[PDB]
Amino acid sequence: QQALYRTAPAPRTLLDVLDATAAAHPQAIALDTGSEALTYRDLCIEIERRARQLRDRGIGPGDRVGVRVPSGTAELYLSILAVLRSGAAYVPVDADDPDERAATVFREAAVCAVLGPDGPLPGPARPLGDPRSAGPQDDAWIIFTSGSTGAPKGVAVSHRSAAAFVDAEADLFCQDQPLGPGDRVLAGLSVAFDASCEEMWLAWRYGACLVPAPRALVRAGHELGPWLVERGITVVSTVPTLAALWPDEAMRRVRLLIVGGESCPAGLVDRFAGPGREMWNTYGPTETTVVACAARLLPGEPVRIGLPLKGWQLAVVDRTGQPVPFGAEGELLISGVGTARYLDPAKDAERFRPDDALGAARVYRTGDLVRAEPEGLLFVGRADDQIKLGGRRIELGEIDAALAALPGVRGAAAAVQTTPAGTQVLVGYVVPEFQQDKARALLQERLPAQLVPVLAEVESLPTRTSGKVDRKALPWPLPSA
Numbered sequence: 468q469q470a471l472y473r474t475a476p477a478p479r480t481l482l483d484v485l486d487a488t489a490a491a492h493p494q495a496i497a498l499d500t501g502s503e504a505l506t507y508r509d510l511c512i513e514i515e516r517r518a519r520q521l522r523d524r525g526i527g528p529g530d531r532v533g534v535r536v537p538s539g540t541a542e543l544y545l546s547i548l549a550v551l552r553s554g555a556a557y558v559p560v561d562a563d564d565p566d567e568r569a570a571t572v573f574r575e576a577a578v579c580a581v582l583g584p585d586g587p588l589p590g591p592a593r594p595l596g597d598p599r600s601a602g603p604q605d606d607a608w609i610i611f612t613s614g615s616t617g618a619p620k621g622v623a624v625s626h627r628s629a630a631a632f633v634d635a636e637a638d639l640f641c642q643d644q645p646l647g648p649g650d651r652v653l654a655g656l657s658v659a660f661d662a663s664c665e666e667m668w669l670a671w672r673y674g675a676c677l678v679p680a681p682r683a684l685v686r687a688g689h690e691l692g693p694w695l696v697e698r699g700i701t702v703v704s705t706v707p708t709l710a711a712l713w714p715d716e717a718m719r720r721v722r723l724l725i726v727g728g729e730s731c732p733a734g735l736v737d738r739f740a741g742p743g744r745e746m747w748n749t750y751g752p753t754e755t756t757v758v759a760c761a762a763r764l765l766p767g768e769p770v771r772i773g774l775p776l777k778g779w780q781l782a783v784v785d786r787t788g789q790p791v792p793f794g795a796e797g798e799l800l801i802s803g804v805g806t807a808r809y810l811d812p813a814k815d816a817e818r819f820r821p822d823d824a825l826g827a828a829r830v831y832r833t834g835d836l837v838r839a840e841p842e843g844l845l846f847v848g849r850a851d852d853q854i855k856l857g858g859r860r861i862e863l864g865e866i867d868a869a870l871a872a873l874p875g876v877r878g879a880a881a882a883v884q885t886t887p888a889g890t891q892v893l894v895g896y897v898v899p900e901f902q903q904d905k906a907r908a909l910l911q912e913r914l915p916a917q918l919v920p921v922l923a924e925v926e927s928l929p930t931r932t933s934g935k936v937d938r939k940a941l942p943w944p945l946p947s948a
């Protein structure tokens with residue numbers, strides 16, 4: 468019973484966080500889109516004018532309000548804050564997602580309204596008219612996580628959890644030179660993906676300024692670089708597949724780089740970590756509020772996912788459910804202040820259960836394999852529903868890493884594909900900065916024959932709405948184009 472990581476946090480709401488910042492930094496720039504540039508004082512005024520409209524419709528605690536507003540716009544973030552201010556919880560769907568996914572989420576969340584680009588629209592449910600403002604027990608957001616084999620499911624996160632996450636991160640990044648007025652935070656992640664909550668509060672927890680960018684820009688590295696320099700961005704939170712394809716010097720003047728959501732390739736550390744830039748790995752399921760553990764990424768060190776945030780508790784366990792010893796691998800379990808819940812009672816019953824190991828009623832079973840060391844966890848891969856090639860269980864991450872390690876490759880992803888006749892091919896998709904016949908030879912020296920993937924060059928790797936790699940979207944079968 469050695470792989471247990473424990474921690475000791477003051478409960479409050481996200482409105483408490485914003486209002487404390489606004490009180491301390493009333494004249495600092497909170498939100499900056501070029502067109503509009505709002506001090507914290509004017510941000511609150513604009514928030515209140517929008518929240519008043521929602522209250523007039525009866526929206527308050529207990530209500531769920533959809534948000535479907537284009538990225539990179541002031542109104543997107545003003546609308547989210549307006550919902551929170553009114554005491555309701557917001558339910559974000561990316562504007563560029565399909566209308567079909569949007570209808571599913573809003574129906575499944577039972578929203579009483581959705582904020583569209585030209586004003587409020589109807590929601591399947593009706594507001595409940597509670598006049599109170601939110602307390603820590605009230606939901607702040609409901610974010611859908613795609614899952615692992617089924618359809619995406621709604622995760623409801625309380626203000627207490629969301630605030631605990633934001634306050635936890637205030638003890639983590641840049642302790643030597645804290646975030647504050649003068650820092651300028653990119654907001655480029657989809658609001659449907661809860662890492663965008665990290666973006667938002669990396670500004671609003673400290674009196675720094677949020678600088679939204681449209682999602683398309685974040686996927687276009689040659690255009691993003693000049694834009695970040697122009698905007699004076701100092702803080703970037705992103706996803707490895709996105710950043711992999713960015714121009715190397717697209718992070719100059721960025722002093723805090725955070726990656727999360729999928730495995731951070733060793734090469735990204737080599738590209739960005741060093742004196743004058745804190746680079747951090749962050750790991751966490753939507754089910755335990757954005758981030759559960761983090762590690763500084765430094766050159767010459769293995770990539771770790773790290774140690775728990777203040778309020779999170781981690782256990783690594785065998786099949787038996789008992790904690791493994793240091794050096795061993797096991798499934799990661801998470802409890803503490805960040806554990807959320809599923810909307811669907813049945814889904815909640817199978818993922819949140821008591822576990823004697825951590826001694827808590829609600830423990831989230833992540834389904835992730837990790838290796839436990841006293842200085843931090845190392846991510847391994849799936850603990851269940853593992854990819855099969857033929858009949859053999861394989862870990863894609865090891866193939867991803869071997870492809871990324873090739874000379875002349877900026878980014879790579881593997882996939883087990885099914886041929887039209889119904890057999891299987893392991894394919895390695897590679898974005899060259901590269902000689903194919905010579906890359907294959909290197910793969911043959913480092914991988915068992917059955918794990919040497921068929922190589923395919925591609926100009927970029929497709930991403931999901933969150934920014935993680937979209938393996939289903941990689942080209943297949945392989946054109947000679």
Ligand SMILES: NCCCC[C@H](N)C(=O)OP(=O)(O)OC[C@H]1O[C@@H](n2cnc3c(N)ncnc32)[C@H](O)[C@@H]1O
Binds near residue numbers: 661728730751
């Ligand atoms: N900076 C904020 C980051 C927040 C990430 C977000 N909460 C999230 O990813 O949540 P989900 O979209 O629900 O899926 C979580 C699952 O993705 C994998 N994962 C997340 N971070 C990872 C990391 N740093 N390294 C390797 N794998 C990671 C895990 O399989 C994890 O179960």
